[PDB]
Amino acid sequence: SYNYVVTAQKPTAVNGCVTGHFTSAEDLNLLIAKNTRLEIYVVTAEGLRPVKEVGMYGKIAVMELFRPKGESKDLLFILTAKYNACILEYKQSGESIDIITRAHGNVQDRIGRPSETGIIGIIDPECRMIGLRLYDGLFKVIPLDRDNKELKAFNIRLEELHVIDVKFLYGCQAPTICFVYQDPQGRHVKTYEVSLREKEFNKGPWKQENVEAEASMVIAVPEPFGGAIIIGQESITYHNGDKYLAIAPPIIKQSTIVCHNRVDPNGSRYLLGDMEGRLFMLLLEKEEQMDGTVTLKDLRVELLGETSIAECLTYLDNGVVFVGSRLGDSQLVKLNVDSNEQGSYVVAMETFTNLGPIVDMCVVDLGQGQLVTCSGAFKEGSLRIIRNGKLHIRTVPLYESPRKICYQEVSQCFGVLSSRIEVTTALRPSASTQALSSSVSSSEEVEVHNLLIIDQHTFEVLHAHQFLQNEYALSLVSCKLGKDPNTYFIVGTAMVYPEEAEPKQGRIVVFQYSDGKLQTVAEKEVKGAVYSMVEFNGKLLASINSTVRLYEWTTEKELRTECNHYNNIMALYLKTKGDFILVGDLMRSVLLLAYKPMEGNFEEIARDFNPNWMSAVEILDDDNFLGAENAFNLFVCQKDSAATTDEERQHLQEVGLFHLGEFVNVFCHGSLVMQTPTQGSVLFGTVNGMIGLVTSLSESWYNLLLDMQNRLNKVIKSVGKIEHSFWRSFHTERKTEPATGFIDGDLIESFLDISRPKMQEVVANLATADDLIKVVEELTRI
């Protein structure tokens, strides 16, 4: 197959943030890592001034600033998810900004089990080394010197296999790590010294001490204090050897603290963000002893107020704090000495739009296509209306998690599945609790699921239906069925109990929203979770646990089973085209079914037998089936045209592979441009808020753009010196192959921005530059 993938909206979720002096010795810089993007801001009188935004050929997992001795300004260390390590330097020579790759390498190991808590990258305070926790039982040390241009690292065996979090401590004569680990005896905190010349671990300054069961975060405190602050679930502790200081404030019991940031350079004040979005300030009280040394007297936590749910926090300057969110919009907030009379010392200054996570979306015409996405989660959950302008985004906050969306044109309303958390009592007012009209279904923290009928124009919750206790709503469709002229809202549900592995119960509830009212038209009791539902030629195609069932709508306004298919593990996704059905499995990739109208049953055509942990499926055409899996890869499967035997004909062949670097949640047919080298248009929405487009090209077009990819890869310089072929290579923990049948549209589009001499070098002996500029412009206009 020949496919063209291009980013329409860059990822918006913030995965990392740091402050330092990177662009110059005087500039105060905020660096933000959004997956594959690195943004550099200068803190100024007017706020954050962006100076350079860069794209990397990798998923940024570590991003740390450090200043070696003799360096006039901070150097950056970046590690990617594909273990591409680079030491970068910001270089400015007058109106020209370059990110110089001081050092680059790949620090992956041939053998190694990736750690549960993920890649950890820490830097020694004296910049003697970079430590990487990549695999269980292996601590990778990269010595920092001017001669180690290749990042020639070495591994030290770590006895503690289950390490939770590790930092380098301050004020140690030798490089020292302090980490929290789990063993059969619980969770503990331990220290080691690293010897570069000996290439080994030595005993830490202070012996191990037992910590909380859910101790999850390590904070290395600067001098004068030294030591570390361990943060868990319901306690905060400080360990500096003989000095142990634990507190258990009730205020932190309600939510888990997920991020921290040091405010004062001496470590007397810290910011702590929790999962509910609450911002606390940890305070370390000083005690200057008469001996001349400074010790810690007490720990205090104060509720500063409420922010966006923080993935990361960073104090910039003058009481201003950047809050980088992946579940909601990021924000600059201001800390004030005096409260707002509401008891809150935090005042929001600026909001940065984040579309992540995009759990579902749809294309509507409210001849110009608009995307409506279910974005965010919990109090950050909202609807996002994206249209071409570049992209214009309108936010409709729901204050609860949206899960599914379907447009009902005849009713001029959207149907949205939503969930809220109650303790029952709701934790805050939300869309489901502030509906104009509300109803409840007839026949610790709990999830309450609702169907919201929301006005298309005002985006106000017209109605909210509360489903049964322990009932989760999974699938939603707006369609007409059979001979019934009414358009219905069909919801697939599942009763959830801890006693059950698979749901033994579930429901298909058919509602009608008419005259600004919601009534339950029909209720069907099924024996499992209704994962997916599609309107299939006037009939209702549903997936219930491991079965795909086609129902008919009778004249009595009830569903009657027409046919069943059982050859699935867990039919999560369903797409249809004509009489074809694409069944996405939990692990068994994609299956092609053909409904047979003359037999009234399903027929299996071909299954992709490569195990793929599917996250979203789509049908490109009758032959091509596009799928996304949880290792951030896209694949395209075809029916084997050269199949001569039946066994060959039972196989869907993976003819296209491509490492996207994004976790695709939803595929939809539609375009954001007004109604060309490419045919077709499929939008996809991902966890990080990135939105992409997949199109199809012919043989000649694909060949030309692949040759251009090769030429551009030869010409274009990569940040971190990562090869584009390596980055786009299909990659799981099991299998790695080069990308096939996929043109990286971003690479091709980048051709228009290179210098004309570089254009001539690229198109030399291909063909003038003007024709190919026209080609790339036509590609852009899709």
Partner: peptide
């Protein structure tokens, strides 16, 4: 009121002044 937010670090007092 909040004596623990009194002395928040200042790198440059001009920063965020003209927000």
């Amino acid at each position: 009121m909040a004596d623990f937010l009194k002395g928040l670090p200042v790198y440059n007092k001009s920063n965020f002044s003209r927000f």
